[PDB]
Write a protein that binds this ligand. Structure first.
Ligand SMILES: C[C@H](CCCC(C)(C)O)[C@H]1CC[C@@H]2C(/C=C/C3=C[C@@H](O)[C@H](CCCO)[C@H](O)C3)=CCC[C@@]21C
Length: 255
């Protein structure tokens, strides 16, 4: 063929709602960042696990940034068509297991290939590999995280595809501990069908009909980064007085 059905009225509403949800929960001016505990950058040119763990100089700032981001994700998820139809128990399972992956996805909007930084930013609010090691993380997370960001940037997603990919990430029927996997799968399928149809209808050439499979592959990549973050957060958590440098929400979500 191959067939290019038009977006239904419902799929059109779904996309409008997700776009609106993202515009209300993602500030592209980063104007709240001055409210976070300030960034501190110690002398660590090369760049010492002992010193990084001793000082955790960027952790209060980046933990506030991540906590703030988790709050925005909860807000976004609440607006996903169908999410509120789930049990409060399943909503929380989905939120806590996807939070770090959605933060990695939504952070792509501040990421720039100009210098491979998340520029929120300023100079104070520009985050590089070395800022992330100053928060207690190691290259086994950071280097594939940068690779992931570049790979995602190069998909050149429409904002519609970006918000759908975040929604699909969150409403995933295979997360540990979900009860109503069938309901979650139904909601995800509706979103996935919307995304597939959108790409067919609206995405030039085509056939860049590998775009959907490239997007699904990013979801698998995110599971990997999630396991590695979990390992590294555990070792950060062993640092005496680390909990003062985090926040209640971060402690709960990642504990
Ligand atoms: C693995 C890290 C998170 C976990 C850190 C922790 C200390 C909790 O383990 C990194 C993931 C990316 C993260 C990062 C920027 C993330 C952003 C996400 C968005 O929510 C922000 C939107 C703000 C408006 O709503 C903005 O795009 C920046 C920079 C430098 C590495 C990290 C701190």
């Amino acid at each position: 063929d191959s067939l290019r059905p038009k977006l239904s009225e419902e799929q059109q509403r779904i996309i409008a709602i997700l776009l609106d949800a993202h515009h209300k929960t993602y500030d592209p001016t980063y104007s709240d960042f001055c409210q976070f505990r300030p960034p501190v950058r110690v002398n660590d040119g090369g760049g010492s696990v002992t010193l990084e763990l001793s000082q955790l100089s960027m952790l209060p700032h980046l933990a506030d940034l991540v906590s703030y981001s988790i709050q925005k994700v909860i807000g976004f998820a609440k607006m996903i068509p169908g999410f509120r139809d789930l049990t409060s128990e399943d909503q929380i399972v989905l939120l806590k297991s996807s939070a770090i992956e959605v933060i990695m996805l939504r952070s792509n909007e501040s990421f720039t290939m100009d210098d491979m930084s998340w520029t929120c930013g300023n100079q104070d609010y520009k985050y590089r590999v070395s800022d992330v090691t100053k928060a207690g993380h190691s290259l086994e997370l950071i280097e594939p995280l940068i690779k992931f960001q570049v790979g995602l940037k190069k998909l050149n997603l429409h904002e519609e595809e970006h918000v759908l990919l975040m929604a699909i990430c969150i409403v995933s029927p295979d997360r540990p501990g979900v009860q109503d996997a069938a309901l979650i799968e139904a909601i995800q399928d509706r979103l996935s069908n919307t995304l597939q149809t959108y790409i067919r209808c609206r995405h030039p050439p085509p056939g860049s009909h590998l775009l959907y499979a490239k997007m699904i592959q990013k979801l698998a990549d995110l599971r990997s980064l999630n396991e590695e973050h979990s390992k590294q957060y555990r070792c950060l958590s062993f640092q005496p007085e680390c909990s003062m440098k985090l926040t209640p929400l971060v402690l709960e979500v990642f504990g």
